[PDB]
Amino acid sequence: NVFRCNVIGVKNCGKSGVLQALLGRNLMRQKKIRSYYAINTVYVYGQEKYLLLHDISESEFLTEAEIICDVVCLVYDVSNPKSFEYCARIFKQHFMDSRIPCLIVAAKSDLHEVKQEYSISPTDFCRKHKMPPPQAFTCNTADAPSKDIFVKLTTMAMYP
Numbered sequence: 001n002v003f004r005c006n007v008i009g010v011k012n013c014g015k016s017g018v019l020q021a022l023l024g025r026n027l028m029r030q031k032k033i034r035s036y037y038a039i040n041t042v043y044v045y046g047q048e049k050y051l052l053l054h055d056i057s058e059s060e061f062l063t064e065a066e067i068i069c070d071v072v073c074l075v076y077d078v079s080n081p082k083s084f085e086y087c088a089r090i091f092k093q094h095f096m097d098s099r100i101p102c103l104i105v106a107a108k109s110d111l112h113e114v115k116q117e118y119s120i121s122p123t124d125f126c127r128k129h130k131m132p133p134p135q136a137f138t139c140n141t142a143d144a145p146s147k148d149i150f151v152k153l154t155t156m157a158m159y160p
């Protein structure tokens with residue numbers, strides 16, 4: 001089965017990097033490339049699934065067409081202290097009452113982590129809203145980026 005995931009975060013938070021990481025391309029190969037969607041096979045419990053990622057550009061609000069999905073990937077940049085505030089805002093605005101599972105991903109984990117300019121820490125925010133702990137991620141690797149978050153996203157997408 002095919003599952004859809006909306007990747008949401010500020011400009012230059014690493015959304016495009018997440019999509020290309022699904023395609024198995026590290027940051028090194030990405031920067032030598034001149035879509036807002038990405039799909040690949042993801043295996044959960046030995047079974048073949050398809051995960052379709054949607055790059056959602058930073059905006060004031062999301063339309064009903066942008067909201068519908070099987071799982072939401074809230075991406076913030078650990079080197080950008082204003083990145084998580086957007087994720088929290090979008091969540092409360094569209095997904096807090098949607099019964100759609102959300103996963104907060106701390107992208108660019110290879111960089112130095114700074115204090116986010118939000119009243120609630122990303123860790124506390126996840127605990128407050130029954131969400132999994134913030135998932136560390138980076139596509140700036142020697143080999144292909146880890147597909148751990150994609151297995152987890154697909155797993156959550158299989159919720160009824």
Ligand SMILES: Nc1nc2c(ncn2[C@@H]2O[C@H](COP(=O)(O)OP(=O)(O)O)[C@@H](O)[C@H]2O)c(=O)[nH]1
Nearest residue numbers: 010011012013014015016017108110138139140
């Ligand atoms: N160090 C590091 N830099 C990254 C990573 N992912 C993206 N970047 C850099 O962040 C910049 C913008 O990221 P981008 O993928 O365009 O995010 P987007 O605009 O939200 O889709 C690019 O110049 C990338 O080189 C990462 O995992 N590690």
Ligand SMILES: [Cl-]
Nearest residue numbers: 010011057058
């Ligand atoms: Cl954007």
